[PDB]
Design a protein around this ligand. Structure first.
Ligand SMILES: Cc1cc2nc3c(=O)[nH]c(=O)nc-3n(C[C@H](O)[C@H](O)[C@H](O)COP(=O)(O)OP(=O)(O)OC[C@H]3O[C@@H](n4cnc5c(N)ncnc54)[C@H](O)[C@@H]3O)c2cc1C
Ligand SMILES: COc1cc2nc(NCCCN(C)C)nc(NC3CCN(Cc4ccccc4)CC3)c2cc1OC
Ligand SMILES: COc1cc2nc(NCCCN(C)C)nc(NC3CCN(Cc4ccccc4)CC3)c2cc1OC
Ligand SMILES: COc1cc2nc(NCCCN(C)C)nc(NC3CCN(Cc4ccccc4)CC3)c2cc1OC
Ligand SMILES: COc1cc2nc(NCCCN(C)C)nc(NC3CCN(Cc4ccccc4)CC3)c2cc1OC
Ligand SMILES: COc1cc2nc(NCCCN(C)C)nc(NC3CCN(Cc4ccccc4)CC3)c2cc1OC
Ligand code: NA
Lengths: 666, 133
């Protein structure tokens, strides 16, 4: 869409309706007459538009009002409530922009943010924006968390987030105007190469791919049309549903062969009965011809009974000769009907081994994107976020995605090498107890009004706990942590002195020998100016390959690559790096997934803050004290950078409403 | 409401493959039993039918007789009457056969005969004799 409707779409909002959030901040309006609603919407969309047309500078209420035309700028209270709702919830004046009004001289409230990845940075940057006092504690010696970016000489390669998944409705579009990311489209063309080294013919590639897509729509059919979501007591995984769909295709291949050959036999049995009829007819014909001969012996002139006998046998014989000729026409039809059937047999198999391996690559591709084996994914909910996909081609950050966190950290108070160990939250406030990562007996203690936890879900799942909550988190939260999936996905960065691959091809696949190793080194990216090849390990492989040393991994890669481009073409790499995110104790995985037995509703449970009990008994219920953000907390955009970012903006707004009050809701 | 084209997924089949951990490869082994036993049965009936074809070798060309093309004629000769009465005794009411034997009498002319001489050739007695066989 374009114009003010454009701005709504570009901010993930319906241009023509008030959202649930708007309803709660503006219930006077949405309960009211239709015309005030259209005003509200116009004002909102228009202000969004103003921000979006120039997100490099703060958009003030005065400026907004200045650029509304009548009747809409008549009601300046409404315009003020709107501008403030939008500012608060990070729909405008988010990211890095030139501040027009200087920051409140005296700060109000104190917030401790655990983790200085994107969700935390974005939250921090808002709370500071709102005049709170914020400090971030980060266990690593750098910001960005799972936005990790290798750098060495001119080599640059993301070991974390790499791809911007379309700019249509993506808040990273705003961020890209503010920060110098060198964005660059990914050409979707992907050549496969079977285990041996040989490009898969365009004939197969297209056939298997189509079959992949059909198998998937099938799983959706099983799920939504046949309610195939639970088998036994246990919930069904996408992986089970794919086996079931595949088995039924295999079955139908057999069922159709059975019926084809069952036609051949029934026709072959017709011909049997016809030939038996034809042999007994030939035999009676022989016997008569004899008798006609014997009767024709008796020479004229003869009595009439002997004349009769001769003629009588002659008709009877030509009657059978007529009948046999009829039966022998039929015979040649039945024999042609059988030449036809042996000519057109239905297909022999569902998929060859060679096909079923290409298919496994497609399945690997899916395991890569969900960062988990498909046997773990919820059949019902794995794709629940599909409705919110952004428009535009996918892009890579070319000077490396760290450029973003690092930008967001400008002006923030970040304690690096500070590993939170315990979080304490009481009616009167919070204390966070951390240690120096370098020297671990050296202890720190941070007191604050609220804690924003952006610990990755892998960390929150760790047994025994890495971080202790005091009091412990309630069952409703801990169970969601347990149900949710936290996957894994690794990268191998190969830095070469010369380019030996097709430069016009951003990516290319390698087909694994087996199913069990389908995610292993299954895909290669060529994205950076320097001559770097990046290779993914996905699915069940990602986890297994963490126990195998870099030299062995780099081996297996060069193998695959020599196999595709020839031994005389593939040098030794100058530099290699191999990620291991599950092993990383500040990540414990790559990103969340909707595990079987979980729902997108768990992502909402993750985002709900915690209100501790009262200190003094019979004392009124405090404020919430422990807030949560991060990719695992946003159900519409999980497992992404944009989603983290958004979750941060969310919590900042929610913390500010809580501790600075919300003028805009009256 | 409808599975994608060229995907087969029936309420009933889905229940059948999922019932057990092995019941997937159960259903698909029993379709290889069925398939190998039909391909076997074809191999017999092909050899069986091949033998019967070799018995018919020659066709029936040795045993065929020329066709008598004689034209219908109104006049009944006593030869023709006597052939008729015998053809009746052998063939009953199959007026077609009867006409072929006599060789120069149409099927109408025969049926006529059955009425004209009914009394004089006791055709009723002759027909009940045919029936008795
Ligand atoms: C291999 C890989 C590829 C990816 N690719 C993409 C992609 O292509 N596109 C995309 O949109 N998204 C991608 N993502 C997802 C993206 O990286 C995350 O969703 C996002 O960066 C998460 O941000 P966060 O702020 O939620 O968590 P994090 O960035 O994990 O931030 C949490 C911070 O907490 C810190 N921490 C942990 N324990 C403690 C402690 N005890 N004390 C203090 N600090 C602690 C961590 O060190 C970290 O800095 C990818 C992730 C991985 C692993
Ligand atoms: C985040 O990345 C993707 C998300 C996708 N989401 C949908 N949602 C579709 C609605 C729900 N289904 C169950 C109907 N469809 C896709 N491809 C479609 C699948 C194949 N068809 C064409 C086709 C259909 C059947 C058989 C063969 C081809 C069009 C694209 C997608 C491809 C993506 O990246 C690549
Ligand atoms: C219901 O129909 C589909 C839904 C899909 N949903 C996702 N979601 C991705 C996970 C979202 N979160 C949880 C991160 N991914 C797909 N394909 C993957 C998307 C494209 N990649 C390859 C790729 C990524 C970036 C750039 C270029 C290629 C592999 C397959 C899909 C394909 C579909 O049909 C076909
Ligand atoms: C090639 O890239 C795309 C093609 C798309 N084609 C359709 N065709 C419409 C009919 C197909 N069925 C299977 C839906 N819909 C999309 N998004 C949909 C637009 C609106 N709805 C409704 C909705 C949006 C937001 C919130 C709630 C509901 C879902 C996504 C598409 C998104 C694409 O890029 C990503
Ligand atoms: C959210 O609203 C829509 C967004 C769309 N975005 C893209 N592309 C952005 C990605 C750019 N590259 C990477 C592809 N393509 C579309 N339709 C295309 C229109 C032409 N065809 C055929 C088609 C025929 C009939 C109906 C729908 C599609 C395929 C998709 C869209 C259709 C939408 O309305 C639904
Ligand atoms: C929920 O409804 C839909 C979502 C879709 N999402 C994607 N995501 C992949 C990212 C697309 N952009 C944002 C980059 N792709 C689709 N079709 C694709 C259309 C054709 N491509 C291949 C292709 C495109 C351009 C040039 C050459 C090849 C594969 C499937 C979709 C089709 C849908 O229903 C209709
Ligand atoms: Na963070």
């Amino acid at each position: 869409p374009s114009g003010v409707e454009g701005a709504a779409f570009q901010s993930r909002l319906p241009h023509d309706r008030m959202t649930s959030q708007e309803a709660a901040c503006f219930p006077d309006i949405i309960s009211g007459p239709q015309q005030t609603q259209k005003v509200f919407l116009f004002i909102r969309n228009r202000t969004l538009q103003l921000w979006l047309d120039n997100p490099k500078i703060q958009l003030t209420f005065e400026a907004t009002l200045q650029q509304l035309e009548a009747p809409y700028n008549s009601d300046t209270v409404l315009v003020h409530r709107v501008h403030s709702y939008l500012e608060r919830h990070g729909l405008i004046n988010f990211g890095i922009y030139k501040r027009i009004k200087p920051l409140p001289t005296k700060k109000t409230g104190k917030v401790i943010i655990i983790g200085s990845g994107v969700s935390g940075l974005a939250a921090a940057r808002q709370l500071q924006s709102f005049g709170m006092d914020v400090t971030l504690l980060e266990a690593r010696d750098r910001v960005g968390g799972r936005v990790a970016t290798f750098r060495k000489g001119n080599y640059v390669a993301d070991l974390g987030a790499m791809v911007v998944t379309g700019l249509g409705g993506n808040p990273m579009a705003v961020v890209s105007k503010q920060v110098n990311m060198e964005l660059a489209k990914i050409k979707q063309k992907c050549p496969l190469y079977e285990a041996n080294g040989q490009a898969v013919p365009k004939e197969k590639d297209e056939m298997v791919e189509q079959e992949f897509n059909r198998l998937l729509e099938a799983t959706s059919y099983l799920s939504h049309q046949l309610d195939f979501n639970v088998l036994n007591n246990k919930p069904v995984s996408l992986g089970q549903a794919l086996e079931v769909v595949i088995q039924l295709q295999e079955k139908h291949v057999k069922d159709e062969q059975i019926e084809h050959w069952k036609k051949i036999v029934k026709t072959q049995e017709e011909l049997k009965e016809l030939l038996n009829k034809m042999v007994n007819l030939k035999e009676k014909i022989k016997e008569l011809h004899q008798q006609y001969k014997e009767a024709s012996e008796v020479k004229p002139p003869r009595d009439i009974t002997a004349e009769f006998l001769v003629k009588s046998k002659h008709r009877d014989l030509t009657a059978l000769c007529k009948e046999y000729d009829e039966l022998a026409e039929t015979q040649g039809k039945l024999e042609e009907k059988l030449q036809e059937l042996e000519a057109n047999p239905p297909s022999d198999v569902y998929l060859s081994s060679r096909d079923r391996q290409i298919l496994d690559w497609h399945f690997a591709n899916l395991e890569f994107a969900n960062a988990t084996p498909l046997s773990t994914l919820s059949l019902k909910h794995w794709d629940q976020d599909d409705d919110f996909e952004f428009t535009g081609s996918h892009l890579t950050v070319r000077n490396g995605y760290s450029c973003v966190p690092v930008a967001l950290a400008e002006g923030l108070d970040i304690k690096l090498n500070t590993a939170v160990r315990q979080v304490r939250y009481t009616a009167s406030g919070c204390e966070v107890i951390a240690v120096n990562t370098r020297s671990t007996s050296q202890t720190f203690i941070y007191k604050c009004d609220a804690v924003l936890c952006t610990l990755p879900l892998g960390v929150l799942k760790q047994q025994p706990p890495a971080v202790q909550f005091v009091p412990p988190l309630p069952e409703w939260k801990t169970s969601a942590v347990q149900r949710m999936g936290f996957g894994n996905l690794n990268k191998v960065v190969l830095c070469f002195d010369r380019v030996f691959w097709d430069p016009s091809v951003n990516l290319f696949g390698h087909v694994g020998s087996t199913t069990a190793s389908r995610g292993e080194l299954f895909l290669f990216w060529n994205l950076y100016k320097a001559p770097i090849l990046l290779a993914l390990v996905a699915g069940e492989a990602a986890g297994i390959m963490e126990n195998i040393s870099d030299d062995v991994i780099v081996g297996r890669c060069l193998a695959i690559l020599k196999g595709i481009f020839g031994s005389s073409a593939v040098p030794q790499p100058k530099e290699t790096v191999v990620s291991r995110w599950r092993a990383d104790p500040w990540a414990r995985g790559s990103y969340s997934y909707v595990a079987a037995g979980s729902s997108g509703n768990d992502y909402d449970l993750m985002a709900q803050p915690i209100t501790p009990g009262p200190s003094i008994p019979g004392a009124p219920q405090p404020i919430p004290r422990l807030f949560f953000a991060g990719e695992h907390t946003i159900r519409n955009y999980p497992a992404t950078v944009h989603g983290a970012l958004l979750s941060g903006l969310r919590e900042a707004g929610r913390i500010a409403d809580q501790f600075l009050g919300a003028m805009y809701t009256l | 409401r409808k599975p994608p084209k060229g995907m087969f997924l029936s309420q009933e089949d889905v229940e059948a493959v999922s019932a057990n951990a092995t019941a997937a490869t159960t259903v698909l082994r029993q379709l290889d039993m069925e398939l190998v036993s039909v391909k076997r049965q074809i191999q017999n009936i092909k050899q069986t039918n091949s033998a019967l074809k070799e018995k018919l070798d020659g066709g029936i060309e040795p045993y065929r007789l020329p066709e008598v093309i004689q034209k219908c004629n109104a006049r009944w000769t006593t030869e023709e009457q006597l052939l008729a009465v015998q053809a009746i005794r052998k063939y009953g009411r199959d007026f077609q056969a009867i006409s072929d034997v006599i060789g120069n009498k149409s099927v109408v002319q025969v049926k006529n005969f059955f009425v004209n001489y009914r009394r004089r050739f006791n055709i009723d007695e002759v027909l009940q004799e045919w029936e008795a066989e």
